[PDB]
Design a protein around this motif. Structure first.
Motif, short mmCIF file in Angstrom:
data_model
loop_
_atom_site.label_atom_id
_atom_site.label_comp_id
_atom_site.label_asym_id
_atom_site.label_seq_id
_atom_site.Cartn_x
_atom_site.Cartn_y
_atom_site.Cartn_z
N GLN A 215 40.19 42.06 43.27
CA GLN A 215 39.19 41.97 44.33
C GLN A 215 38.10 40.95 43.96
O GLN A 215 37.88 39.96 44.68
N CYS A 216 37.43 41.17 42.83
CA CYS A 216 36.42 40.23 42.36
C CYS A 216 37.00 38.84 42.14
O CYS A 216 36.46 37.84 42.63
N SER B 197 38.36 40.02 37.44
CA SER B 197 37.38 40.99 36.99
C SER B 197 37.91 41.68 35.75
O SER B 197 39.12 41.86 35.58
N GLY C 128 40.98 47.05 38.21
CA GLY C 128 42.33 47.37 37.78
C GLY C 128 43.31 46.24 38.00
O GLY C 128 44.13 45.94 37.12
N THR C 129 43.24 45.61 39.17
CA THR C 129 44.16 44.53 39.51
C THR C 129 43.98 43.34 38.57
O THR C 129 44.86 43.05 37.75
N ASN D 115 28.10 36.13 43.63
CA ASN D 115 29.18 35.16 43.74
C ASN D 115 28.68 33.75 43.98
O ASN D 115 29.41 32.79 43.70
#
Ligand code: GTP
Ligand code: GDP
Ligand code: MG
Ligand code: MG
Lengths: 431, 113, 436
Positions: A11-12, A138, A142-143, A226
């Protein structure tokens, strides 16, 4: 040495990756459809580094977007520049991650990584001379953290004659999506130490500082951070994106900035500290630039360099300015705080100048620093982590996904060891 | 030919040593009988079972001859590899190896005698 | 989607299920016939509901009771059209406040169609998260058939999640003397399967409707409506999707520090009579204050003498992030709120922006902004020890055991389940120790 293949995960990582491509796509002069419209040739002297060359006078980001969420790619496509991405380079799953590293690196992530590798190989076969790979993710999620470290492993093992480059972001107790950010971060660092050649450490907490205090944004939204990330990344890649003897490619820059195998963790620095869409009533000078970009208030990692000695520094000044003034001011900053620099690396502070300044800013100062102060980051994590790892709390959410309890102690130990390494090289003398 | 590095060498050499003290378990946590979800519990029992039994049996006066028999495992409990959790070392002592687990998933043995 | 599936077992679970889907239809805007005005026949609510052909929006729920009197009200009531009829499954002879008749004799013969039908729901989905099970800790049906049903769902659906909604029994409306036995049993067998069990002290609900609604002898109706409102607060972060709410599975992760410690005390903020009118809306700070008074609590216990392990706040209605942060500042140090030395004292907040829709004539005074806190505290062990006492007198003389054994079960299962209970209590102890 030429092409850089770029990846963004999580996501990040996908958000900040999108913003980075917006930035450099605007600097070089690329539109959301892909055509070139700039008014300078220097913009296209080294444009292939981050852009596939497509028919129809178009430009495609040699990038690869990876997630296990569905909706992030939706936020990409309907985003502004979401039209330009070669759709085959979108690769994403449907399970999610849950801010779970183990899920990203062993289970739901491992059922997509080969499909990532095939797109990576499709972009690397149409390459001529591939430099390396730039990665953003990130470390608290988790991803990006898990599946990211997985990708780093398999790619650096598929082409070990190329460069591996990461822009990782930290867990922040002042932001905090979860309360297993220390675990995710710890393991991801354990990988990043042996895996990557360069790691530009963005500290989420530090960015919350620069937003709430210097910029006075009282409720920092994610995009607010960001922007600072996007500016930092645009600056540090100036050496690679424009004609320059100094730090022409990843290998050169890495050899100049990395004197020890493990220690490749860089504190970036931006100046001036700019909000979104704000006027410059009195754009900075050269002394003001050089003075701020080494000051702790402009640091991307939540650390004090007044506590740690730089091993190497790559300073980059953007915008036309007096080169003599630049050299002089840099000498000033070096030998006024020479008790904060290692002397056993002579002429270690390299400096390159660019002419097209960042968007809107007349002049800026981008700073990369291999500092032994960066340990103030690790020692935060390695404490945050230990506090929970003592009674083995929240372990079932990873061992239940199929890991080994020793894989954590290898990590905590490797990190405490990296910190002892940093202090060791800090107490160095000329004997 | 410097110092400081030396204190870092002392590190770098130990980290590899730690690696072998992990790459030992793995290929040595294989070998012959080395599986079934109770693998940890089995290795626990095995590291027990033997390496023991110095003391033997001097009882009391009862109102009933109470005695216990242990039967051995059969084809069903062996094919689907179940585990033996009862041992008798002397004609006077029945030992149970109650496989417990703490709150934090640390497997331990409640050794009822 | 990221679908879910609700399951409702026993008198309590079915009636409270009807209150729950009542509120779901009200908030999300559906009429008892199953039609919605706004939808196009892949949204945040398409996880709890499925679209048919004629836009007849239909729940993803299976209702079960071993004695069809309590489900027949569904097929006679206003929502008889709402349901696919094949998932209103009923038996014949009620379990008769007997766990063993749920887990063994009666449930065995019906479980297989229960799961062929749950199957018929699961094949409708593209990416199912987990099952929401609604049952009582007391009655035979809800204890037995849920223990077995979960024992089966863990076989057929191992990867999936399983959230319990549990009804601790209150002595005032207790319909049996052997409620402790049933409770201890179904907790014992259900523990290693269930991932997160929200507990509801019926005594506490009764006291709530004694104080804030001023009902002298509240009916089962009032209680089901209140509990339904709280459940709607919890699930709301699953059924809506602003940029300010995260999945209940996102911060389920932070609520459960140990596999056996998965019981979060809940707390619900404004509870005021719609009759006793004349009322000023409460600020974010005031409801966040109320989220720590044992009055507005869900289980009868005392977290002030106990340590915390997590904290969640699900706000719904008018709430700005800054209001939450400020209230969290006023609460943080000003109170004696304690965390274990192994846990960050952080809060995660799910801001949901839909207001709390109460019930027509539902004595819940409608409000603009509400909060529901999920605190995983060690004082919740109180509710277990209140069981094991009422148990360890009866089981001290084995009184009433002869029924449960007389329907299939052994005795040693009792000493085992009880021993396991005491183990759980000592685990809620071991959480409290520190280090040096
Ligand atoms: N809150 C609430 N609790 C209920 C309700 N109905 C029953 N209970 C509780 O459940 C316990 C008795 O179990 P029941 O659910 O009535 O029994 P059952 O599930 O129908 O099982 P059988 O009676 O054998 O058919 C009592 O202690 C009640 O407190 C209800 O409608 N609302
Ligand atoms: N700078 C920045 N950091 C973020 C953003 N979203 C999440 N984070 C941080 O990254 C971590 C969450 O990782 P995330 O990418 O959301 O999880 P993932 O989807 O599993 O990779 C947390 O520690 C957050 O503080 C963002 O938009 N910008
Ligand atoms: Mg994600
Ligand atoms: Mg019934």
């Amino acid at each position: 040495m030429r092409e850089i293949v770029h990846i963004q995960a999580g996501q990040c990582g996908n958000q900040i990756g999108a913003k980075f491509w917006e930035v450099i796509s605007d600097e070089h002069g690329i539109d959301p459809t892909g055509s070139y419209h700039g008014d300078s040739d220097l913009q296209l002297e080294r444009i292939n580094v981050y852009y596939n060359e497509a028919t129809g006078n178009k430009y495609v980001p040699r990038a690869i977007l990876v997630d296990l969420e569905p909706g992030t790619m939706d936020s990409v496509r309907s985003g502004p520049f979401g039209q330009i991405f070669r759709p085959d380079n979108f690769v994403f799953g449907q399970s999610g991650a849950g801010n779970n590293w183990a899920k990203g690196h062993y289970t739901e992530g491992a059922e997509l990584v080969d499909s990532v590798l095939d797109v990576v190989r499709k972009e690397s076969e149409s390459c001529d001379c591939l430099q390396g790979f730039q990665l953003t993710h990130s470390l608290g999620g988790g991803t990006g953290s898990g599946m990211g470290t997985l990708l780093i492993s398999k790619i650096r093992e598929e082409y070990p004659d190329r460069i591996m480059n990461t822009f990782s972001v930290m867990p922040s107790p002042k932001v905090s999506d979860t309360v297993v950010e220390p675990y995710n971060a710890t393991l991801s660092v354990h990988q990043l130490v042996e895996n990557t050649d360069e790691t530009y450490c963005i500290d989420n907490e530090a960015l919350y500082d620069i937003c709430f205090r210097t910029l006075k944004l009282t409720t920092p939204t994610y995009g607010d951070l960001n922007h600072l990330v996007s500016a930092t990344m645009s600056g540090v890649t100036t050496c690679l994106r424009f004609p320059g003897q100094l730090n022409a490619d990843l290998r050169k820059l890495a050899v100049n900035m990395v004197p020890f195998p493990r220690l490749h963790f860089f504190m970036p620095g931006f100046a001036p500290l700019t909000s979104r869409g704000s006027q410059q009533y009195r754009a900075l000078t050269v002394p003001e630039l050089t003075q701020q970009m080494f000051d702790s208030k402009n640091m991307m990692a939540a650390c004090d360099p007044r506590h740690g000695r730089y091993l190497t520094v790559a300073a980059i000044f953007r915008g036309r300015m007096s080169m003599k003034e630049v050299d002089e001011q840099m000498l000033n900053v070096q030998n006024k705080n020479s008790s904060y620099f290692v002397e056993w690396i002579p002429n270690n502070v390299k400096t390159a100048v660019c002419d097209i300044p960042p968007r809107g800013l007349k002049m800026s100062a981008t700073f990369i620093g291999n500092s032994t102060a960066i340990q103030e980051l690790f020692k935060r994590i390695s404490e945050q982590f230990t506090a929970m790892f003592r009674r083995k709390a929240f372990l079932h959410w990873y061992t239940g996904e199929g890991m080994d309890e020793m894989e954590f102690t290898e990590a905590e130990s490797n990190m405490n060891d990296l910190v002892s390494e940093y202090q060791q090289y800090q107490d160095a003398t000329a004997d | 030919s410097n110092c400081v590095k030396e204190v870092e060498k002392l590190q770098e050499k130990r980290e590899k040593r730690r690696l072998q003290q992990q790459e030992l378990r793995e290929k040595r946590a294989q070998d012959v009988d080395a599986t079934n979800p109770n693998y940890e519990i089995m290795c626990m029992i095995r590291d027990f079972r033997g390496s023991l039994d110095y003391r033997p049996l001097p009882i009391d006066e009862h109102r009933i001859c109470v005695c216990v028999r242990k039967r051995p495992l059969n084809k069903k409990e062996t094919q689907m590899k179940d585990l033996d959790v009862i041992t008798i070392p002397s004609k006077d002592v029945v030992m149970v190896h109650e496989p417990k687990q703490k709150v934090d998933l640390t497997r331990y043995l409640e050794n009822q005698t | 989607m990221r679908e879910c599936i609700s399951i409702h077992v026993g008198q309590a679970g079915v009636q409270i299920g009807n209150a729950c889907w009542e509120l779901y239809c009200l908030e999300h805007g559906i009429q008892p016939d199953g039609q919605m005005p706004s939808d196009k026949t892949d949204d945040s609510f398409n996880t709890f509901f499925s679209e048919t052909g004629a836009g007849k929006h239909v729940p993803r729920a299976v209702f079960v009771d071993l004695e069809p009197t309590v489900i027949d009200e569904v097929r006679t009531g206003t929502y008889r059209q709402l349901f696919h009829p094949e998932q209103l499954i009923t038996g014949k002879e009620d379990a008769a406040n007997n766990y063993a008749r749920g887990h063994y004799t009666i449930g065995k013969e019906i479980i297989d169609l229960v799961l062929d039908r749950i199957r018929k729901l699961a094949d409708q989905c593209t990416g199912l998260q987990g099952f929401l099970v609604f049952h009582s800790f007391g009655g035979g049906t809800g204890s037995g058939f849920t223990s077995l049903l979960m024992e089966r769902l863990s076989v057929d659906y191992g990867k999936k999640s399983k959230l319990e909604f549990s009804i601790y029994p209150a002595p005032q409306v207790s319909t049996a003397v052997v409620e402790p036995y049933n409770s201890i049993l179904t907790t014992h067998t259900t523990l290693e399967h269930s991932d997160c069990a929200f507990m509801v002290d019926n005594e506490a609900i009764y006291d709530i409707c004694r104080r804030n609604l001023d009902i002298e002898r509240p009916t089962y109706t009032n209680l089901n409506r209140l509990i339904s409102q709280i459940v709607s607060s919890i699930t709301a972060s699953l059924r809506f999707d602003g940029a300010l709410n995260v999945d209940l599975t996102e911060f389920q992760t932070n609520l459960v520090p140990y596999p056996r410690i998965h019981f979060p005390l809940a707390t619900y903020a404004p509870v005021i009579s719609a009759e006793k009118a004349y009322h000023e809306q409460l600020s974010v700070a005031e409801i966040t204050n109320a989220c720590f008074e044992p009055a507005n609590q869900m289980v009868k216990c005392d977290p002030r003498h106990g340590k915390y392990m997590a904290c969640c706040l699900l706000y719904r209605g008018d709430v700005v992030p800054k209001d939450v942060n400020a209230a969290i500042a006023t609460i943080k140090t000003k109170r004696s709120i304690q965390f274990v030395d192994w846990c960050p004292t952080g809060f995660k907040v799910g801001i949901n922006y839909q207001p709390p829709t109460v019930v027509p004539g539902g004595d819940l005074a409608k409000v603009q902004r509400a909060v529901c806190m999920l605190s995983n505290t060690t004082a919740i062990a109180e509710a277990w020890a209140r069981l094991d006492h009422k148990f360890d007198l009866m089981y001290a003389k084995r009184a009433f055991v002869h029924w449960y054994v007389g329907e299939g079960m052994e005795e040693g299962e009792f000493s085992e389940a009880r021993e396991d209970m005491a183990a759980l209590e000592k685990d809620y102890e071991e959480v409290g120790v520190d280090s040096v």
